[PDB]
Specification:
The structure is a homodimer of 586-residue chains. Chain A is α/β, with parallel strands linked by helices. The first copy, chain A, has four domains: 2-96, Glutaredoxin; 103-133 and 220-254 and 389-451, 3-Layer(bba) Sandwich (FAD/NAD(P)-binding domain); 264-385, FAD/NAD(P)-binding domain, CATH 3.50.50.60; 472-573, FAD/NAD-linked reductase, C-terminal dimerisation domain (Enolase-like, domain 1, 2-Layer Sandwich). Chain A is built from 18 helices and 26 strands. In chain A, the strands form six sheets. In chain A, strands 5, 6, 7, 8, 9, 10 and 21 form a seven-stranded mixed β-sheet that branches. Chain A has a five-stranded antiparallel β-sheet with strand order 22-23-26-25-24, sandwiched between helices. In chain A, helix 6 packs parallel to helix 14 and helix 8 (154-175) packs across helix 9. Chain A is globular and about 80 Å long. Chain A starts with a helix and ends in a 27-residue tail after the last helix. At the A-B interface, helix 8, helix 9, helix 14, helix 16 and helix 17 of A face helix 8, helix 9, helix 14, helix 16 and helix 17 of B. The structure holds flavin-adenine dinucleotide (2 copies) and 4-(5-amino-1,3,4-thiadiazol-2-yl)phenol (6 copies). One flavin-adenine dinucleotide (FAD) binds at residues 108-114, 131-134, 147-149, 153-154, 157, 222-223, 251-253, 271, 292, 393-394, 426-427, 434-437, 439 of chain B.
């Protein structure tokens, strides 16, 4: 147990010092390593309840039982006297840079997970390379370092959501006494895009600075794993070469899908293109009903667009469907049109005018599930019909990395693949929630297990979410229907209430915001799931995710006192049950 | 234990039925009570693990051991056959209305706590009266039913805070692409006040409707307790009479203090007058440094006012002083002036012009702690120098209710005074946090213990707060300095970080928002206190208060995953300690 941990830690750490906080000989080795600019992990044995056993087991590797003990890539280097000997003879730099491989770690993919893992590994002296390449979209769109969230995801989508929210802030301002006239104010798409892209550019640059300052090698090149320790890279001049690494992290993410219909790739766009589009989309059709589809349709309408969403079956498949219907009803009452139970079968009427900065014009044909026809003209058609990896481009099938039937990597609970030195994190890890903070935690925690002797695993359960539709939807845990399927309706109690933000009173709806707690009767009214539709829903939801992680019950919500006046305090006084039939209105 | 609970429950309930969910004889008594419109508490013995013992102990009162058993004001009324006998003979209405007193409950004070207690007691058949009277301010201001929060506190102050926030929403809108020009927009105070007061008026009316629909008697009269069961009332015609009640709840709240200096009462105002003021205050001095003082100065400045705050010693005494200084620094950088270490020694230069709706003009003289002089002219002077009860007006000292040296009521942990039938809730309960949700929980929980056999007490520990200054400050638990005083600096670890809202990037400060967790090393890094300065701080803080109630540790925050992009997620990845000396900047 202790011995098995120590073997794994010694074998995979790049540079590690076993030490105690009270030893001046350990302090004297630290100071020499710092002055030589030698980064390393350190384990302070006097701070571990198991340290006496670890100190005994170290002798299996070094034939000594004292501290300090310095290891480099699985090899005992020496005690105090020996390390200073190498230092005085200027032999130390060559000893700690000695490796069978070019890098201790090669990360394939420079996005949320991969950048987090690479920076964290370099902290402990792992010689690290991060590879990133952005294959252009069909119309040619490309972007800089940072991945999907930074460039074409969470960051620009929430900034355009805020632009949409400010439309209603402007309307509200009149009722609170300000002299503006909202009906005479308009929005300039190109001005907003320039500001969004200026922020994204500061993030691209920030990541490059961060890697340089952590001594991480950044290669803007496409990587391919051709054997367990060999990565073939192709650069911007099509030069092809091979680099080797001890540990490999796959972190290449996904890209948008297109439907297999005529004209889709030629004349439509995806979210990859939307966030840098030089012209306002105009009259827009969004095909799909995921959170990407609804978030984009929502802010486009708030910015003055004529928007339609084509829904094949249901909204927000996989989310609580009572909540999904309330989200969509709010959008439909506030300027979004819906074509329900409908799919597309795209013809070009006008080519995009790039010189005068105008969209083209398209004719869309489709059909409803009963057979009736759809036919209408749009200036822009956005596909939001799912995302997928293309690991055949990343991974030679002779390496032996197992994939599932959706093409994602099958991993153990420590992110290890079926090849012992190769790991996968982020969206390509089969079965895991596909979110940026999950990818960051996985990569950071993994780097610490590989190179600093850590043991902590990432916990993927009850991860909270927020959908940034015009009225936001936050959730943590099970949907009501999933809880009833798992435990049975007789064991499920649901407490719920409508509410009205105080900010909405002077601004003139009473009963559109809504919240509920889904609870298990036979486990002390355990909170299985929390759901809220209203302003600032992500700020509301986040703190409750800690309580749910700790096993909160309805009694825990009851005994906690509210903060007044807030939206969130309504969770502290819920009392109306669905079984009672009593109305939830205010 | 069981027998002592049952004696207290029988003695004080107004109308209570002991029953089981499976008994058709109990269902048959319920249906008769409902049809006669007889409200009552019910205790279902088959749902209590102690019910077998309760059923045995009932025989001590009734000489029978079966269900149903109906009691009225401590007296056994009968089993099934007997109750239907009274019903058939039309004797039942007179039996259940029989009382030695006019009311089962008299509530003195119709504010946050008193309205909550009165409505809840009426649910269980307690015949209830609520008394409310609003003594006018020195200049004559008065208002309707609902108490301090509704009329001259949390509700209007947060609505004017929102009006202030919308000033910065208007500036931000230009950067996000909207065509407005903020420098050409102004604010109309009287328009905002009319809208705020229209909402307050809907709340006044709503409370009157609610009491009428719960069969609560509302008397707009001043109440005085002259003996344990006798309340003398004085109405709007100076008619004086006496009503009697079994249980009494004191819930009369506090009013603003004035400094003992010439001209203060004659020429200054307080928060009681501010929220319905017919004219804009103009150039304003706020004397004091409480959360009331800073909240009011903050929104007045955001609405275009020239504002100064006179601070005797420190800001936000009793709150974390690192956080208090950051709150004040933000205000000073954003248009509020501060006169530090200064107190006033007020002369009238112009009388208020009520016909043309203009303030007067005043000369304020004061001095700094070193002896230097203060002298400046203002249009309005607002005093925010504390609040106090005046229980000598409410409570004859011969009744025997014990008060502390600040004039607040000394209560047991179930809100009982030194007179056994008299209770106190809300701001006048000595030692308790003076907040609206605390008053509401105390009153609701108390009504259930008196009239429904409940046992649950109000928990007054770790109650979260938010100060609605221009940049908001939320907190839950100990300040850093209180934790260090209690446990010693060697046992305290503090994790902290600056942060920048994503909404602030395109809008153009980097390092003003701030958060920290104050933790106890020797108790598994228990979170003793949480603190955040930033937008939407009350929404951020609320959910964490449940986790802190449950004993959250730093490890609980670490294992929980963030929601991206939010401000609140920064709590899930804190790592920089104050002891390390590493910078907290972004
Ligand atoms: C529109 C949209 C909105 C979203 N909004 C949110 C949100 O609000 N909150 C949230 O938590 N999540 C959100 N997400 C999800 C989030 O973007 C992803 O979960 C996250 O980016 C996944 O991180 P990753 O490291 O797995 O991959 P990525 O961030 O996709 O990074 C992979 C990188 O590797 C590169 N790469 C691929 N193949 C190779 C190769 N062979 N060689 C070298 N480099 C290669 C890719 O081009 C890319 O730069 C959103 C996603 C989208 C599409
Ligand atoms: C400016 C300001 C802002 C505040 N903001 C907040 C905030 O954001 N959040 C928060 O949680 N708290 C806030 N508070 C505190 C909150 O208002 C109080 O904690 C709460 O109102 C106390 O409730 P209560 O029932 O104890 O008394 P009150 O609400 O004061 O009700 C007492 C009532 O009894 C009446 N009364 C008095 N004497 C008699 C008598 N003899 N006979 C009959 N009736 C009588 C009074 O006139 C009054 O109507 C604020 C307070 C102020 C002053
Ligand atoms: N952080 C923020 N996100 N949205 C804001 C907003 C939205 C709608 C409004 O009516 C007013 C303000 S502020
Ligand atoms: N900057 C760049 N890095 N790699 C590039 C690349 C790689 C493989 C290809 O097939 C085509 C282009 S371009
Ligand atoms: N018309 C359509 N709307 N959604 C579609 C979809 C969504 C996710 C997927 O992974 C695959 C397809 S097709
Ligand atoms: N609920 C809300 N409270 N404030 C809001 C706001 C404030 C400042 C801004 O810049 C934009 C919006 S929305
Ligand atoms: N509407 C009102 N109810 N009571 C009033 C009152 C009571 C005592 C006084 O001393 C003066 C006025 S006015
Ligand atoms: N000049 C002053 N600023 N604050 C004061 C104060 C505050 C609370 C109190 O309870 C009493 C006095 S006096």
């Amino acid at each position: 147990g202790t011995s098995q941990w120590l073997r794994k830690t010694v074998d995979s750490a790049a540079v590690i010092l076993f030490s105690k906080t009270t030893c001046p000989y350990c302090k004297k080795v630290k100071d020499v390593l710092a002055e030589a600019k030698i980064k390393h992990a350190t384990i302070e044995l006097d701070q571990l309840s198991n340290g006496s056993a670890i100190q005994k087991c170290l002798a299996s590797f070094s034939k000594i039982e004292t501290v300090p003990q310095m290891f480099v890539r699985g090899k005992f280097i020496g005690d105090s006297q020996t390390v200073l000997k190498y230092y005085s003879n200027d032999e130390l730099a060559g000893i700690v840079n000695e490796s069978k491989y070019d890098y201790d770690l090669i990360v394939i993919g420079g996005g949320s997970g991969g950048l987090a893992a690479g920076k964290e590994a370099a902290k402990y002296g792992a010689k690290t390379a991060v590879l990133d390449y952005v294959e252009p979209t069909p119309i040619g769109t490309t972007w800089g370092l940072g991945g999907t969230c930074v460039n074409v995801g969470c960051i620009p989508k929430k900034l355009m959501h805020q632009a949409g929210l400010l439309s209603h802030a402007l309307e509200d301002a009149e009722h609170f006494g300000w002299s503006l006239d909202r009906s005479k104010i308009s929005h300039n798409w190109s001005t907003m895009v320039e500001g969004v892209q200026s922020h994204i550019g500061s993030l691209n640059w920030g990541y490059k600075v961060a890697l340089r300052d952590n001594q991480v090698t950044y290669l803007n090149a496409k990587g391919r794993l051709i054997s367990p320790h060999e990565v073939q890279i192709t650069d911007k001049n099509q030069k092809v070469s091979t680099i080797t690494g001890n540990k490999i992290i796959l972190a290449t993410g996904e890209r948008p899908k297109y439907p297999e219909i005529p004209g889709a790739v030629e004349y439509g766009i995806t979210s990859d293109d939307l966030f840098s589009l030089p012209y306002f989309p105009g009259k827009t059709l969004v095909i799909g009903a995921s959170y990407v589809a609804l978030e984009c349709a929502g802010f486009l309408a708030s910015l003055g667009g004529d928007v339609t969403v084509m829904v094949r079956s249901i909204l927000l498949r996989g989310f609580d469907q009572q909540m999904a219907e309330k989200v969509g009803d709010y959008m439909e009452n506030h300027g979004v049109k819906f074509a329900k139970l409908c799919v597309p079968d795209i013809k070009q009427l006008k080519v995009v005018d790039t010189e005068n900065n105008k969209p083209g014009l398209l004719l869309v044909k489709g059909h409803y599930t009963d057979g009736k026809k759809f036919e209408e003209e749009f200036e822009t058609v956005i596909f939001a019909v799912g995302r997928e990896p293309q690991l055949s481009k990343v991974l030679c099938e002779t390496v032996g990395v197992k994939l599932d039937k959706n093409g994602r990597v099958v991993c153990t609970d420590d992110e290890q693949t079926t090849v012992s030195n190769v790991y996968a994190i982020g969206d390509i890890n089969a079965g895991k929630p596909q979110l940026t903070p999950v990818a960051i935690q996985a990569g950071r925690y993994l780097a610490r297990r590989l190179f600093a002797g850590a043991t902590e695993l990432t916990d993927y359960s009850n991860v909270a979410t927020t959908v940034f539709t015009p009225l936001e939807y936050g959730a943590c845990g099970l949907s009501e229907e999933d809880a009833i399927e798992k435990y049975g309706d007789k064991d499920i109690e649901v407490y719920h209430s409508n509410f009205k933000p105080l900010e909405w009173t002077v601004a003139h709806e009473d009963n559109v915001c809504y919240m509920k707690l889904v609870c298990r009767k036979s486990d002390n009214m355990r909170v299985l799931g929390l759901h809220v539709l209203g302003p600032n829903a992500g700020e509301i939801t986040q703190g409750y995710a800690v309580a749910i992680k700790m096993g909160a019950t309805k009694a825990d919500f009851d005994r906690t006192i509210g903060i007044h006046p807030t939206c969130s305090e309504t969770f502290t006084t819920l009392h109306v049950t669905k079984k009672s039939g009593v109305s939830p209105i205010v």
